[PDB]
Amino acid sequence: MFYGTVSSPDSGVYEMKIGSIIFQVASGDITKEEADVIVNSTSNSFNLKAGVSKAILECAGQNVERECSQQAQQRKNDYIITGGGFLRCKNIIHVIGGNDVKSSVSSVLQECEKKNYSSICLPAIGTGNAKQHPDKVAEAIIDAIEDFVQKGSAQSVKKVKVVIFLPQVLDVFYANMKKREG
Numbered sequence: 001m002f003y004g005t006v007s008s009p010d011s012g013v014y015e016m017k018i019g020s021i022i023f024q025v026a027s028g029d030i031t032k033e034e035a036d037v038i039v040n041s042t043s044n045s046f047n048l049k050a051g052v053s054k055a056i057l058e059c060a061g062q063n064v065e066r067e068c069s070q071q072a073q074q075r076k077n078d079y080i081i082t083g084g085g086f087l088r089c090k091n092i093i094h095v096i097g098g099n100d101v102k103s104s105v106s107s108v109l110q111e112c113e114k115k116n117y118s119s120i121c122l123p124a125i126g127t128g129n130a131k132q133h134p135d136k137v138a139e140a141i142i143d144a145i146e147d148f149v150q151k152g153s154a155q156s157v158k159k160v161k162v163v164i165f166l167p168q169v170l171d172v173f174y175a176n177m178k179k180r181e182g
């Protein structure tokens with residue numbers, strides 16, 4: 001109903017259409033990416049500095065760290081939105097790695113439509129300190145995008161890219177894409 005064909009447009013990058021959205025996966029360092037939104041996978045305190053979250057907060061800088069801890073004290077949040085600091089993005093959306101990954105990605109997509117943003121980059125949310133299993137994470141991320149497209153919600157969002165630090169986790173995402181292809 002929604003899925004195109006898996007191909008490789010550039011070395012180490014694999015992509016397929018999901019409705020009107022280009023879905024891409026690659027291995028590498030997420031802090032080197034440019035997108036309207038970059039997603040951080042953190043703790044329920046929004047102050048984790050381990051693995052991908054260490055790289056994101058160190059490269060974003062101390063003003064972003066401070067914005068996180070100010071919002072965390074204000075109310076109980078499922079996720080928080082900050083500026084991008086010294087990352088190449090307009091906003092960082094910090095999601096809780098231990099939460100339901102489908103729910104987290106659905107929230108990211110909705111917030112990007114509210115801002116008329118076109119591009120998103122995320123890590124393999126929950127596979128670091130939260131220790132969620134990589135094929136459950138892949139299934140949940142791609143399911144969230146399919147649901148968003150099925151509801152007719154994709155308008156401004158055009159590109160969703162997962163940049164994955166371990167090549168072995170990239171292999172799991174690729175297999176999940178191939179299972180779905182038209």
Ligand SMILES: Cc1nc2ccccn2c1C(=O)NCC(C)C
Pocket residue numbers: 028029030031051052055165
């Ligand atoms: C070493 C490292 N550099 C980067 C840069 C980008 C994202 C994460 N990392 C890591 C990371 O995830 N370390 C945990 C483990 C594999 C040692």
Ligand SMILES: [Cl-]
Pocket residue numbers: 041042097098125126127128129130131
């Ligand atoms: Cl995590």
Ligand SMILES: [Cl-]
Pocket residue numbers: 052123124125127163164165166
């Ligand atoms: Cl990752």
